[PDB]
């Protein structure tokens, strides 16, 4: 049941995002309701999350592949819908496996950002 409910919720989110994308392209992302901005952000993360590096495309991707167990797929997406990962950067979900990989990539991005901020601050 948990698998079914999560899948339907993801589809509903993506369906709504597609409809909102029509408005976004013409006018702009900043001409939307504040509620719809949250949906857009979650949908974009979902789209990025759906991507996965395959073990057969280590040449075209340049990255090690992943095998995601179904139980991790359900848990990772279910948490994302709840919004517990809103703070995570959008790109952290791109070309990764389970939620754990997302967090690890976010940590590395945060460390790099902190290093850049330190370099900028030290420049003063």
């Amino acid at each position: 049941v948990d698998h079914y409910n999560v899948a339907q919720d993801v589809v509903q989110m993506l369906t709504k995002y597609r409809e909102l994308q029509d408005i976004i392209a013409v006018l702009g992302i900043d001409e939307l309701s504040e509620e719809d901005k949250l949906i857009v952000d979650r949908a974009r993360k979902l789209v990025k999350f759906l991507s996965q590096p395959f073990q057969v495309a280590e040449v075209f991707t340049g990255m090690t592949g992943h095998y995601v167990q179904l139980d991790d797929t359900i848990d990772s997406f279910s948490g994302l819908l709840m919004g517990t990962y809103d703070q995570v950067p959008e790109m952290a979900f791109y070309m990764v496996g389970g939620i754990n990989s997302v967090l690890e990539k976010a940590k590395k991005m945060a460390e790099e950002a902190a290093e850049l901020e330190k370099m900028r601050r030290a420049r003063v």
Partner: peptide, 30 residues
């Protein structure tokens, strides 16, 4: 008060999430 008398995989996700949130907060400070 009477409650006082008588009375791990998910933890890793929580631990990682806390660390990332801490880093994102630290960078903001300075």
């Amino acid at each position: 008060e009477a409650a006082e008398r008588n009375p791990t995989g998910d933890n890793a996700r929580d631990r990682l999430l806390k660390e990332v949130l801490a880093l994102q907060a630290r960078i903001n400070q300075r």
